[PDB]
């Protein structure tokens, strides 16, 4: 609920110093502050004006303070990002930005659960964001080397990394046992021989980065906003759309071990693929809808093929990422029983594709 | 002219990586590109396509590169660049990386020292002037960034040596007139001087002032202000009485010191009325509908505000060019200028009688 009291107060000073009007002459003992998010990385704070103040002019009564905690060139990108996406009304304002962290809009919102991605009005929001995402030009490398790049970063780690407790090696043992560094150049062919435009990626598009935002429940459009760009680049756009697609079977909400739950059946029918690619397409082509209904339907059917292959990708990837994370990360969470889940979803939807 | 080959190549990778359309497979043999400015920091150069080569959408046919060279002092004004281009009041930016950022390449040419007096430019700097200071951006809004820079760079000019017999005997004199105490008397004018608190540039200068090509006939529209390496919120007397100390400096001439500082050239009453004249209704719209009693008061209170902050202008940038004499590799009358400015302080303090 309430900071410890040393960042209460470089809290206060952060306010007091970067945000105008009654910022500027407010009392550290009027001064509202609670967690919204611990860890040891990216904490988050409410910091707000008392309800008994007046604004002076248009500074706003609450933001966000963002602390960075345990992390150079990565600040610089995501900062410029942050900026730039602010600049164009595609993110919250940014109001302060100093070493240790920085100040954002407060946007009353709150997150999608997993079983919200299928609303068909949320799911062609999502869709629609996004291509409005991938239509961004950004002052970053256009070369798309993010995806390939990563998997063999993660998969030189994978196979170089030994376990103590019996478990965790049985579990390693059948993960390697599917020829990780053979199936990762099946995967370079087929994706090499599948068309797919190179624009600037989420990479991480999942129901803990969509804000429903509050009082807007009752729209049909323009109710919700993207964010947390950590893992953003330009990248296929196959990507992008396959990695949302898989993140409908995976819940990270269960509060007991593993603390996830995985269900292949949840993967979105082809109806349900049509009705998001159906939102997306007229928000990236300009007057995709005047075209005659058989390009509409090849041009869908194409993009149907590219992001359930570019979906393999997706669990490849995040599987690798996860038997990482189980040696190094200090979060509590089943890392090697989420790595085989996406392993399993990997050849499921390999044998679905006929590859 | 010609780039190293190492940069060549590094150019040629950069400008492929992170420009759209017909750069992005364009070969070695096909790159041009040419220095606009050498040294180990802040190097610029042109880059283009061949003259040949069709655009495919709407990507540069030439960008400039800047290479740093020599943390958070990189991320602000990364920040503050990016801004500024999505705002349409600094260059677009192209490709940002850890050694430096590809730009939009403006065709203008930099104003020579003479130009700043002409009275088209000077309104038109006033009017660019007053439009910086109206901008909201996400940086300490508390003005320490003055007496900060003062205080910081008296400590390194506290500490600083030399063993060649003609600088002991410059820094001897400069060192001769207390500067801590000096300081100090100026932070007691500044602070009994009454000035807005806004986003300054704080280097308003000839060299930082592009003449746009083809706009030459343009009255009111002809200027960009660039280069916000030391910009900060700040006195607004700073940014304007640093502007009128810059008609007394010229940093074109051939011959050392490689500045020419002339106390005579510093705006008269009328060419200072005329510049705060354009400056007063570009940063409040309601101006000019004041009387012509509260418009005349403003104005004269103004010309006593951005008089005093000018002798910040002096103190500042001569603590910064004694440092200079010590850390630069770059060639200059260092030691000369810090004693120009430091003149300049001394003689304008008399005038006003503080
Ligand atoms: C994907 O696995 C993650 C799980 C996290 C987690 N999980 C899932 C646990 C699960 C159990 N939660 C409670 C019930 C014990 C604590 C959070 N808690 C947190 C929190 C965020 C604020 C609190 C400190 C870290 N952060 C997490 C971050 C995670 O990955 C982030 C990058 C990977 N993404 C790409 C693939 C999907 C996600
Ligand atoms: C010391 O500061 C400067 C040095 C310059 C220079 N210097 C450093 C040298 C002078 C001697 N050099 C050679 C001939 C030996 C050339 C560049 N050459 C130029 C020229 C202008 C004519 C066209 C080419 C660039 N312009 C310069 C401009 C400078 O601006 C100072 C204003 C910035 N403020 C911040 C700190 C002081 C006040
Ligand atoms: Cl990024
Ligand atoms: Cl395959
Ligand atoms: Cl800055
Ligand atoms: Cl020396
Ligand atoms: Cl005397
Ligand atoms: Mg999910
Ligand atoms: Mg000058």
Not at 150 to 158: A, D, P, S
Request: hydrophobic fraction near 40%; charged fraction near 25%; include cysteine.
């Amino acid at each position: 609920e309430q900071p410890e009291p040393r960042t209460r107060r470089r809290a206060y000073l952060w306010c007091k110093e970067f945000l105008p009007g009654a910022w500027r002459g407010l009392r550290e003992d009027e001064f509202h502050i609670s967690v919204i998010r611990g860890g040891l990385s990216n904490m988050l704070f409410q910091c707000s004006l008392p309800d008994t103040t007046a604004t002076l002019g248009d500074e706003p009564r609450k933001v966000l303070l963002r602390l960075y905690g345990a992390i150079a060139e990565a600040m610089v990108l995501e900062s410029v990002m942050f900026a730039i996406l602010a600049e164009r009304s595609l993110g919250p304002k940014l109001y302060g930005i100093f070493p240790q962290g920085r100040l954002e809009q407060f946007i009353p919102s709150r997150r999608l659960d997993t079983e919200e991605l299928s609303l068909p009005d949320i799911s062609a929001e999502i869709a629609e964001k996004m291509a409005t995402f991938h239509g961004m030009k950004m002052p970053f490398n256009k070369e798309p080397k993010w995806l390939f790049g990563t998997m063999e970063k993660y998969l030189k780690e994978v196979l170089r990394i030994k376990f103590t407790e019996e478990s965790r090696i049985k579990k390693l043992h059948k993960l390697l046992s599917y020829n990780l560094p053979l199936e990762l150049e099946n995967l370079r062919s087929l994706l090499e021989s599948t068309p797919s435009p190179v624009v600037f990626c989420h990479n991480d598009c999942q129901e803990g980065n969509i804000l429903l935002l509050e009082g807007r429940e009752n729209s049909e459009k323009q109710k919700l906003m993207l964010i947390d760009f950590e893992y953003s680049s330009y990248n296929y756009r196959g990507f992008d759309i396959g990695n949302h697609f898989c993140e409908w079977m995976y819940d990270y909400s269960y509060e007991k071990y593993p603390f996830f739950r995985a269900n292949i059946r949840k993967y979105p029918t082809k109806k349900q693929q049509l009705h998001f690619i159906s939102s997306y397409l007229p928000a990236f082509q300009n007057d995709f809808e005047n075209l005659s209904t058989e390009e509409k339907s090849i041009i869908k059917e194409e993009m149907l093929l590219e992001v359930n292959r570019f979906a393999l990708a997706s669990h490849f990837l995040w599987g690798l990422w996860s038997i990482v994370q189980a040696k190094i990360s200090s979060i509590e969470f089943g890392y090697m029983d989420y790595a085989q889940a996406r392993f399993d979803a990997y050849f499921h939807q390999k044998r679905k594709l006929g590859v």
